[PDB]
Design an enzyme around this catalytic site. Structure first.
Site, PDB file in Angstrom:
ATOM      1  N   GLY A   1      -4.245  -3.849   7.369  1.00  0.00           N
ATOM      2  CA  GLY A   1      -2.893  -3.640   7.841  1.00  0.00           C
ATOM      3  C   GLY A   1      -2.876  -3.407   9.329  1.00  0.00           C
ATOM      4  O   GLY A   1      -3.900  -3.561  10.010  1.00  0.00           O
ATOM      5  N   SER A   2      -1.731  -2.998   9.833  1.00  0.00           N
ATOM      6  CA  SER A   2      -1.602  -2.794  11.264  1.00  0.00           C
ATOM      7  C   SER A   2      -1.073  -1.412  11.616  1.00  0.00           C
ATOM      8  O   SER A   2      -0.482  -0.737  10.768  1.00  0.00           O
ATOM      9  CB  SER A   2      -0.748  -3.904  11.869  1.00  0.00           C
ATOM     10  N   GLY A   3      -1.340  -0.989  12.846  1.00  0.00           N
ATOM     11  CA  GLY A   3      -0.859   0.292  13.349  1.00  0.00           C
ATOM     12  C   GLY A   3       0.183   0.059  14.412  1.00  0.00           C
ATOM     13  O   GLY A   3       0.663  -1.069  14.537  1.00  0.00           O
ATOM     14  N   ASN A   4       0.518   1.097  15.217  1.00  0.00           N
ATOM     15  CA  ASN A   4       1.444   0.913  16.353  1.00  0.00           C
ATOM     16  C   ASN A   4       0.896  -0.218  17.245  1.00  0.00           C
ATOM     17  O   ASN A   4       1.657  -1.062  17.737  1.00  0.00           O
ATOM     18  CB  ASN A   4       1.591   2.210  17.143  1.00  0.00           C
ATOM     19  N   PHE A   5      -0.446  -0.258  17.381  1.00  0.00           N
ATOM     20  CA  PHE A   5      -1.171  -1.296  18.115  1.00  0.00           C
ATOM     21  C   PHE A   5      -2.284  -1.794  17.194  1.00  0.00           C
ATOM     22  O   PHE A   5      -2.765  -1.041  16.347  1.00  0.00           O
ATOM     23  CB  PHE A   5      -1.767  -0.721  19.423  1.00  0.00           C
TER      24      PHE A   5
ATOM     25  N   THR B   1      -4.695  -4.446  14.556  1.00  0.00           N
ATOM     26  CA  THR B   1      -4.844  -4.766  13.134  1.00  0.00           C
ATOM     27  C   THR B   1      -6.178  -4.205  12.714  1.00  0.00           C
ATOM     28  O   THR B   1      -7.206  -4.429  13.380  1.00  0.00           O
ATOM     29  CB  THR B   1      -4.823  -6.303  12.939  1.00  0.00           C
ATOM     30  N   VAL B   2      -6.180  -3.549  11.561  1.00  0.00           N
ATOM     31  CA  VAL B   2      -7.363  -2.923  11.033  1.00  0.00           C
ATOM     32  C   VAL B   2      -8.058  -3.786  10.008  1.00  0.00           C
ATOM     33  O   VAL B   2      -7.433  -4.236   9.056  1.00  0.00           O
ATOM     34  CB  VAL B   2      -7.033  -1.509  10.499  1.00  0.00           C
TER      35      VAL B   2
ATOM     36  N   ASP C   1       3.790  10.195  15.833  1.00  0.00           N
ATOM     37  CA  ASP C   1       4.015   9.195  14.765  1.00  0.00           C
ATOM     38  C   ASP C   1       3.564   9.768  13.422  1.00  0.00           C
ATOM     39  O   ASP C   1       2.943   9.084  12.613  1.00  0.00           O
ATOM     40  CB  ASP C   1       3.289   7.860  15.086  1.00  0.00           C
TER      41      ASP C   1
HETATM   42  C1  LIG Z   1      -5.789   0.539  -0.365  1.00  0.00           C
HETATM   43  O1  LIG Z   1      -5.228   0.038   0.826  1.00  0.00           O
HETATM   44  C2  LIG Z   1      -5.684   0.479   2.058  1.00  0.00           C
HETATM   45  C3  LIG Z   1      -6.904   1.138   2.223  1.00  0.00           C
HETATM   46  C4  LIG Z   1      -7.328   1.586   3.447  1.00  0.00           C
HETATM   47  C5  LIG Z   1      -6.530   1.327   4.551  1.00  0.00           C
HETATM   48  C6  LIG Z   1      -6.879   1.847   5.879  1.00  0.00           C
HETATM   49  C7  LIG Z   1      -8.036   2.588   6.063  1.00  0.00           C
HETATM   50  C8  LIG Z   1      -8.240   3.095   7.336  1.00  0.00           C
HETATM   51  N1  LIG Z   1      -9.231   3.831   7.805  1.00  0.00           N
HETATM   52  C9  LIG Z   1      -9.196   4.156   8.997  1.00  0.00           C
HETATM   53  S1  LIG Z   1      -7.784   3.571   9.881  1.00  0.00           S
HETATM   54  C10 LIG Z   1      -7.345   2.857   8.336  1.00  0.00           C
HETATM   55  C11 LIG Z   1      -6.183   2.123   8.093  1.00  0.00           C
HETATM   56  O2  LIG Z   1      -5.262   1.906   9.076  1.00  0.00           O
HETATM   57  C12 LIG Z   1      -3.970   1.430   8.722  1.00  0.00           C
HETATM   58  C13 LIG Z   1      -3.925  -0.130   8.713  1.00  0.00           C
HETATM   59  C14 LIG Z   1      -2.939   2.103   9.681  1.00  0.00           C
HETATM   60  C15 LIG Z   1      -2.833   3.619   9.509  1.00  0.00           C
HETATM   61  N2  LIG Z   1      -3.421   4.118  10.665  1.00  0.00           N
HETATM   62  C16 LIG Z   1      -3.695   3.244  11.604  1.00  0.00           C
HETATM   63  O3  LIG Z   1      -4.150   3.475  12.647  1.00  0.00           O
HETATM   64  C17 LIG Z   1      -3.303   1.873  11.152  1.00  0.00           C
HETATM   65  N3  LIG Z   1      -6.008   1.653   6.877  1.00  0.00           N
HETATM   66  C18 LIG Z   1      -5.297   0.725   4.386  1.00  0.00           C
HETATM   67  C19 LIG Z   1      -4.874   0.282   3.148  1.00  0.00           C
HETATM   68  O4  LIG Z   1      -3.688  -0.352   2.934  1.00  0.00           O
HETATM   69  C20 LIG Z   1      -2.627  -0.360   3.820  1.00  0.00           C
END
Ligand SMILES: COc1ccc(-c2cc3ncsc3c(O[C@H](C)[C@H]3CNC(=O)C3)n2)cc1OC
Length: 277
Positions: free
Chosen positions: A16-20, A22-23, A132
């Site tokens: 997914g993505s954050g304010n900035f 993609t993870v 946030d």
């Molecule tokens: C079961 O689904 C998931 C499992 C793990 C994640 C996950 C694990 C994770 N670990 C460290 S940052 C991180 C992260 O970031 C997010 C994309 C946002 C929240 N914070 C941020 O900065 C960006 N997402 C996400 C999942 O689904 C949306």
């Protein structure tokens, strides 16, 4: 701090993505063990320097934080794009988790939101404002271990001020914002307390979106009339009372995180006592 791209293995799938950024999930070769990591990368076709600065400012905030209830930064790397390497919270966002796990008990929710208040008590003692704080940013390592994430909008407070004054309004998460953020662009640890109240409401509502069907301006108008969201079904009265206390209009009378964490701590032990009986 500066990591080696050859010791990093990225998977193609995007979490997914954050304010900035993609993870993506990855693996990092540490001194001996291999560590599963979450890697924040940039989608920057235009090669815009602003996108790089935003991610580096985020990395700069995380580098200064060290607490069990905060997502740890492993380091950074400049390869295909700038990359912010963090620890992995396998279970993901708290709102998405609770939406899919309605059997999670009120005791378990109190435990998790108490853990968020410990991390925020630490952030407040460190004089950083999150800006946030929402259920989507609370990540689960396990069903019993929550950590605060996404420091993209975070600011280190000046030595002489207890608030950050925003210059530009931007894409703001208005539904999580205190009235002084909306009215005066002023962000403090007390503004984060207001967002923590909204986060608590989301957790006890099993990840439901706050102020459903309302525009940001209608939320501002509701709060200005002294109205607040109702008690979620099955939410303990002590927890709804605490959410209302977080939603104190006047920033001076609103509790700080030390007072919030203590209330949750004492209530959690009362529930732990009830369960044993
Ligand atoms: C079961 O689904 C998931 C499992 C793990 C994640 C996950 C694990 C994770 N670990 C460290 S940052 C991180 C992260 O970031 C997010 C994309 C946002 C929240 N914070 C941020 O900065 C960006 N997402 C996400 C999942 O689904 C949306």
């Amino acid at each position: 701090v500066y990591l080696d791209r050859k010791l990093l293995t990225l998977e193609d799938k995007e979490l997914g993505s954050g304010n900035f950024g993609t993870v993506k999930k990855g693996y990092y070769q540490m001194k001996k063990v291999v560590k599963t990591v979450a890697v924040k990368i940039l989608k920057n076709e235009a090669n815009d320097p602003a996108l790089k600065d935003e991610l580096l400012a985020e990395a700069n905030v995380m580098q200064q934080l060290d607490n069990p209830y905060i997502v740890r930064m492993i380091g950074i790397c400049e390869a295909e794009s700038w990359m912010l390497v963090m620890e992995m919270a396998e279970l993901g966002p708290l709102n998405k988790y609770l939406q899919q796990n309605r059997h999670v008990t009120d005791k378990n929710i109190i435990e998790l939101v108490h853990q968020v208040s410990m991390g925020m008590k630490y952030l407040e003692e460190s004089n950083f404002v999150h800006r946030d704080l929402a259920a989507r940013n609370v990540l689960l390592v396990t069903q019993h271990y929550a950590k605060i994430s996404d420091f993209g909008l975070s600011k280190a407070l000046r030595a002489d001020e207890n608030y950050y004054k925003a210059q530009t309004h931007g894409k703001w998460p208005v539904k999580w914002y205190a009235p002084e953020c909306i009215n005066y662009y002023k962000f403090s640890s007390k503004s984060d307390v207001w967002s923590f109240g909204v986060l608590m409401w989301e957790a006890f509502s099993y990840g439901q979106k706050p102020y459903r069907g309302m525009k940001g301006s209608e939320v501002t108008a509701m709060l200005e009339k002294g109205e607040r969201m109702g008690c979620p079904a099955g939410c303990p009265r002590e927890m709804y009372d605490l959410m209302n206390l977080c939603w104190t209009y006047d920033v001076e009378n609103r509790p700080g995180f030390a007072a919030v964490e203590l209330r949750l701590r004492n209530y959690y032990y009362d529930v732990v006592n009830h369960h044993h009986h």
